[model samples]
Target: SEFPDWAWADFQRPEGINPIVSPDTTTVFYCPMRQDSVAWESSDTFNPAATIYDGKVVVLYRAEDNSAVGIGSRTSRLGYAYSDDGLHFNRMTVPVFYPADDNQKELEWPGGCEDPRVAVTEDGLYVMLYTQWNRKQARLAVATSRDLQIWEKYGPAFAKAYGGRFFDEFSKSASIVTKLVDGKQVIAKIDGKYWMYWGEKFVNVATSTDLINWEPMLDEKGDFLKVITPREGKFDSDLTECGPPAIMTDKGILLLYNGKNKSGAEGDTLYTANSYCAGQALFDAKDPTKLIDRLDKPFYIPESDFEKSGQYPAGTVFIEGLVFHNQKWYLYYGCADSRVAVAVYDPFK
Candidate 1:
């Protein structure tokens, strides 16, 4: 009941400009490690993350190369794009982040890079949390940039945590808490340590001192403390995955995340079984671990035909990007793991 009315952002899917980015077989990039020009984003482009950069909305989207067998086997590279208006964008010819001849090569070679979630520091440093999938395990890695063009990869976030205890743990989808200051979303610190909400099957919390190296908070039992879990007979009956960075609102911390439904009888009756919808949750600002409230029903569901057409026919509106621009919020998402899409939300409207 403490959920603020303003937190219920009503998103509008604008027509004609629904899909902002899609797969282009013609676009090629010169791979540094492979030493060959390849059609990097020929197959699919989805699961984008966004942040405000230099007075514009910048998107870092996962683009797959059509070389391997199937979806999970393909190599994914993150391409850069900037939009003056939140609805339209101009993407770079080559990807900005991909498998390189660096220390993370073994963990990011064939499986490459996937799912990026970016956040900005108060001093203007860009911190990106992306998955380094090596086909064996998915490790949530870290990268940083100041100009948004050049990036410095820092391998896995938990590579050194607890003497490499969770170094091999399967982790992805990290949402660092942020606070809107001067109408811009910047990383928020709780008790002198940066906090991140992350996980796949369930929601979990972690803390970081430098935004790169992170340690997952554990219960007294020495296991990962579950912040939230999937709900039965609901849209998120299967999983609750972290989406974009959670923001510190006036009322609480508003978290917009992707919730996957289960198949068969345990699934939701409203949408198709095994579909991905967008849901919102509220956590206490003073104590980030304490869950205060959650939306009983998903605020956003897959509606566009394109959102249900491609590789993931079960449909998906995987929300990952949220930015405040011109007093309005731009909500970006992946459409059925095929293309990038956007929705607008005006709190006043």
Candidate 2:
């Protein structure tokens, strides 16, 4: 009931032909790292990370190989795809980034690479923040690449800060602050440092000088500085998961995040309890950590069969990708952990 029409209405979704990317039974990729043949994207292909590259929309998404079955148990990998128009995407057969016999193997072998969030520097260095899931812990790892096809894996984003004190701490999701430039989202430096909003249950802050490494903003006792917390009476009653990178807008620094409601009567009455919906938060542009305002309701939620009847029944429109292409905001999201879907916000339309 509180979302404004200008910035929130167009996201309701467009085009009947949806679920842009889905699990494919075909496409066998030879795993160079594992030294075995695997249908790397057979079981599930969701939770996508998108960016603009070479005048097109490029998506580096998470794909799971055919394994034991069910969620969180399969070996995940990153697959590549591109689209001339934001909706019709052309995919590559093999996974571009996956766990191989590398130094990061200990942290990403069995669980492989999970969700990814990418931001490009002004000079054109593509920095990716992804999860290094070893089944035991989910570390927010770092990777860099010139071209989307070849990626250089770095360890956890905090492995070097404070003598590696928070190196082993549980961390996931990294949304680097960016400013729209030339109609593209470019990493922005606020107060001479690159700021990122991250975390699963409650949003947290971290700063970086070099895009590859990050230091969590902590108090004197070395505790996380919470940026955004779940609201008990609002849409994010259960968890506030960070989504696509936060962007600096004229109004403020806008963060598009995934909000989960508590199950049963404890959840927000407007949305299905326990479901995940995309929500918006506005933070002070000068001071990225200070919350200025927020939408009381969800920005986008599940309304289709593919979104409600997939692997997750409670329904989810887990938004993670956003790009301004052809003067429209293309929101790419994961549908119930089963397929990739898109919705457009065309202010000009």
Candidate 3:
């Protein structure tokens, strides 16, 4: 019975290649137009968010621009890149974060800034937590950066801790628990405050002392406080969000989720057709919401062909970003919400 080194069965997926970040339509990056010149990342660049900071591996993706009068309707920004060896990447022409007009810009106008999740505070700063999207409310925003290319926005992490009652609902991803210590990953704290796991269709848990004031963990009819739902037939039934930034190892708080798959349940007979894969659970680092082990199936899915088609064509890999760097374990995802993928895990396999 020798396993546990943060075992999800000792994680290993580096065989005959897996997405290592695709989609490079020649790598553009522009947006905000009134009429003419348009190339704002020429349609689709998927969910990413990784951090290593001063030693490299930045990432931060999620682009999408082509004017869009239809099809997913464009807009979303937050593009930037870097990588020393986490499999080649070197973007950055414009877009380090978007949606402006100050004071959160009416909850981020016309659907701007989407999926992001970088964390680092323990006083090292960084923090990101994105998704402000006003394509009709999505909220869950906060920003700050010491050098990930200057951010600093800070607005509505929970709208003064529920006084405004989730300030227009919806919310999105978050994670933020991190702690790899001597190999990096930072932003941790368990019994002393600062925790987060966030949500989209399930999964919740939030608390902060000042990582920009969060509070969710409700339930007394206040909402939130699910900690991982959806499982009518497994592979996450149909929604579970929250990825990247959770890891706290030593066998507890792992959380690398993204589930969603329940068109006819039983995971639609093994993925795609109402898709989004990648899963893992494990909470309870001093009761982060209890639950201790998960992963009943998905360990990452959505096979190639740009993850089975674009603009989320019933196929998605959708993890946010995870990094362990040089010694291995990169992960990162989002292929059928369109582009950006990466996978590698070699905990000494």
* Highest lDDT against the true fold, candidate: 1
lDDT of 1 at 127: 95
Question: Highest TM-score: which candidate?
Answer: 1
lDDT of 1 by residue, 1-349 (tens): 2434846558899779978999989999888766988899998889999998989999999999877667446888998889998888999989989998888999998788999999899998999999998789899999999987899999899899889999889999999999988887899998999999998799999999999899999999989989989999888899999999999988788889989989877878887888999989999999899998887678888888989867788989999999999888999899999999999988876
Please give the RMSD of candidate 1 to the true structure: 1.7
Which of the predicted structures, 1 or 2, would earn the higher lDDT when compared with the native? 1
Per-residue lDDT for 1-349 in model 2, tens only? 3465324446756676477888787988887666878999998888999998999999888898886765447888988989998888899998999988888989997899988998899999999999998889999999999888889998999999889998999999889999988776799998899999999999989999988789999877778889888988777989999999988877888899999998766678888888898888888999888988777788788988888767778888888888888898888888888888888887676
Candidate 1: lDDT of 110?
78
Q: Which stretches of candidate 3 lie over 4 Å from their true place?
A: 1-6, 13-20, 26-37, 42-61, 64-129, 132-139, 142-157, 160-173, 176-204, 207-214, 217-242, 245-253, 256-282, 289-339, 344-349
For model 1 the TM-score comes to 0.97
Superposed Cα deviation of residue 130, candidate 3 (Å): 3.4
Candidate 3 local lDDT, 298-325, one digit each (tens) = 7778767888788778778888888888
- The candidate 3 region of ten consecutive residues with least summed lDDT is 29-38
Mark the regions of model 2 whose C-alpha exceeds 4 Å error after superposition: 5-9, 70-72
Show the lowest summed lDDT stretch of 10 residues, model 2. Answer: 1-10
TM-score ranking, high to low? 1, 2, 3
